[PDB]
Ligand binder design. Sequence first.
Ligand code: HEM
Ligand code: HEM
Ligand SMILES: O=C(CNC(=O)C(F)(F)F)N[C@H](CS[C@H](Cc1ccccc1)C(=O)NCCCc1cccnc1)Cc1ccccc1
Ligand SMILES: O=C(CNC(=O)C(F)(F)F)N[C@H](CS[C@H](Cc1ccccc1)C(=O)NCCCc1cccnc1)Cc1ccccc1
Lengths: 424, 424
Amino acid sequence: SHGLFKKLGIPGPTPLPFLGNILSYHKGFCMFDMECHKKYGKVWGFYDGQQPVLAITDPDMIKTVLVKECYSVFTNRRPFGPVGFMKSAISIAEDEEWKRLRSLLSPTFTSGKLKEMVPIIAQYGDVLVRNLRREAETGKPVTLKDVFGAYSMDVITSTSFGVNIDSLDPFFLSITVFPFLIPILEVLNICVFPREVTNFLRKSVKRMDFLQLMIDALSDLELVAQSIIFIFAGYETTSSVLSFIMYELATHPDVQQKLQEEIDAVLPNKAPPTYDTVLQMEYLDMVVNETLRLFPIAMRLERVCKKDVEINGMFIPKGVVVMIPSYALHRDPKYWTEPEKFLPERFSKKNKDNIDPYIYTPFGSGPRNCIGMRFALMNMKLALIRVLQNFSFKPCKETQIPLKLSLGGLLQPEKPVVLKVESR
Amino acid sequence: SHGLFKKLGIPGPTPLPFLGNILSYHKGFCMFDMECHKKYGKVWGFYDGQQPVLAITDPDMIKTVLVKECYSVFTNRRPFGPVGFMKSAISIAEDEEWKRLRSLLSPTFTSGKLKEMVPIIAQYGDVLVRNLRREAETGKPVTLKDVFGAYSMDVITSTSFGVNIDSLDPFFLSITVFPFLIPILEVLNICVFPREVTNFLRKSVKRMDFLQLMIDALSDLELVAQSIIFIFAGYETTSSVLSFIMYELATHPDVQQKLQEEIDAVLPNKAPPTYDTVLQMEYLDMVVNETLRLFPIAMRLERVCKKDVEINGMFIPKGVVVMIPSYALHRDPKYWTEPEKFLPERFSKKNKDNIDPYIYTPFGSGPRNCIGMRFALMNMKLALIRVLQNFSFKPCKETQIPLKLSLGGLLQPEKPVVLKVESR
Ligand code: HEM
Ligand code: HEM
Ligand SMILES: O=C(CNC(=O)C(F)(F)F)N[C@H](CS[C@H](Cc1ccccc1)C(=O)NCCCc1cccnc1)Cc1ccccc1
Ligand SMILES: O=C(CNC(=O)C(F)(F)F)N[C@H](CS[C@H](Cc1ccccc1)C(=O)NCCCc1cccnc1)Cc1ccccc1
């Protein structure tokens, strides 16, 4: 099974026995993709243990995999286990079981359902502000992920259920080389999610929203599973990106102020953000997108090719994991001038047309893109408005400059993001 | 996972933890099915370890599973491992990979391709006769499987390749309870087929037939895999059924003689069997079918239901193994008068119409029935003609009467079949 890419004439790094190419991960998912893009070009292949993975960087082939051929060939991602009852989580569910969940959960983020949330989100921003107001009157450097995550959790627990609260590579490696082991642990009730975190949220907080539109077909224990996915995403993604944004706004203060100028213009007299005002602030949208260009928290996009196929002149055999190196594509000089620099004018209406939506995919594409994309943009933006309407952000003595990325996991920073905060 | 049949309102024996219902196998595949048919009726469910199995006995639902819904829902059988390169064997291959093999191997048993084999098979029958002539002049009781299997091998090695030669529940159990283990051994090169039997037939006997119609798309190592399936089937099935037949002909001598009468009538002056003469001997066909009613060597038919479905008023969930208890159906008094008795007049043109081809399925049905059905009938019949044209068969002092069936495995006898042979 280690000669497939040799047989198909697809270039790639030479795999070692059993391990595959996993030892190359010693600089992260990303430095590996950025490297292989340079060594081999538009298409290359490698192995996660015994699992062949084909990496593609061709926009047409990309568009083919995620959109044109999704329902037929590329419906599902790489199997993830041990999972337990989380196999039915929408992000993990396969084929027809996924099609049913995606439909039942689609109407949660309609432009009207989000618009219903602008009044309820509007509370914890003031909880957010007042919490940042206490650690700013004091010149104590702030850990931004913690105050954002406290906010992010406050939104996800209420935006979906309605509980108000003031929020104040160990073994997975083995899996890659031992995917044959996954059904082993599937019969041991072993979960990658420690069975004490799930027994907890197995609080069936349902009473006599996201919670609403479910019981309004669907089961109950699988309702738990979906809730975990949303609580996690709505928490960690928002917090993480909010931290990436504040770091970039401080090291680039001209961007931070020019943003502040737009916010106080659209919202005069520190006005309260509403749905329609947020969709008018362009420079805000540009800053968010440019951060997501530099820091796509998903790093990769994956689909299991579920039958033999010839797309865009390349044959692809059943079972191969097709992969899209999002991080590498967002940083490719063959599409971006000086790609390491935080330049939000890449996303201005003058220049926003010179960008392929299959090179820039921070939320995926096709029927299995990020179901929570529009929410995340809205939730984050409301945070950025309220936070920046009051405070500026300077680097501090401990602030990591330049910021190193962590290794594997998600796109997360090595040392936490800590910045000075000043009150306007 | 042990409450599915409880949830679906499907009756069945109460499963034990981990083991499922496998401890009930202590009287064989068959006494278990015959029992559960009586306890529960048209439909029941059980577990092979963690694997739910739904057993159906409704002719319409049967016809639906094997024919109407084969290509959509019930394309594949229960996964079998560890297999190695034998995953590509046609009997084992799944979905689209199977559709391609079945087409490429279909034209091997056209009525003309078989007709081409009547002259070549006609040799080893005389090799067969002369070998039985030596152990009959001596009143030494004969082991029939051995002289048949020697014949059966002589046909399969030449009918498919062309080499002429005078042919003179241990761990599988664990699998049922440890199906999660199968990919474990799949990475160890562990095969249920001892790697020394395969390294052998990996004799690539191909030179500068079944062998022919292959190289005339198809690979090479998978060509080996197909050859093993045919060599085995063409050997053991023929030998086994030939033995079941001779046992029944001896204990029922009126049938043995009335057969002998038909053979010497259609083939006067001990004439040589040809293609068209064999398809005129009806009473021969009746004897073969009635033996295959009592002794269906496959015992069961299985399909993995690959998506949610409602057939004939019963919902069936994805992943369940649907099963057809062939042995139990061939022995059901609700379709056969006095079903334990060897009565070949069940298959006479007067009475052959009162038989459902979805209760009587010795070769399966639908697109995945026995691809070698017509060959086996022909090969066996030529054996029966030549053998019975010369010798009678009496029970002997050691002959097992009544014959006990073995446990599990295939439909094979406990003590071997040994009978007296007399020369006419
Ligand atoms: C900055 C915030 C976020 C980013 C950058 C992001 C990005 C992504 C990406 C790249 C994917 C995979 C797309 C693909 O495979 O083609 C994805 C999937 C998904 N996201 Fe997000 N996401 C974010 C926030 C959220 C939030 C707040 C939710 C709330 C529920 C969410 C729910 C999901 C789900 C359920 C999936 C799986 C969808 C499916 O497989 O059908 N995400 N996201
Ligand atoms: C008395 C002789 C035989 C009997 C009773 C018999 C019976 C069966 C049965 C019941 C099946 C399963 C059908 C189903 O799942 O619906 C089967 C499949 C099969 N048989 Fe036979 N068989 C015999 C001889 C042979 C011979 C001589 C060959 C020679 C190649 C052969 C090749 C196969 C193959 C390849 C399959 C799998 C077909 C597929 O899955 O597409 N069999 N047989
Ligand atoms: O994590 C991989 C990487 N594969 C691997 O082999 C590896 F060993 F490294 F782990 N794959 C995702 C499928 S499992 C994951 C399990 C989980 C984690 C935390 C909490 C609950 C469940 C999962 O549900 N995540 C998406 C849920 C939230 C989210 C995050 C980010 C953006 N939107 C939504 C598929 C996936 C990847 C990136 C983005 C979305 C979805
Ligand atoms: O053996 C089961 C039972 N399942 C189980 O879980 C169990 F643990 F018990 F083993 N299933 C068959 C799929 S594997 C088998 C592997 C093999 C065996 C010997 C030589 C080569 C390969 C296989 O290729 N056999 C069919 C090949 C020859 C044949 C025999 C009889 C009739 N025609 C052809 C599927 C199957 C069953 C019955 C009849 C045909 C096909």
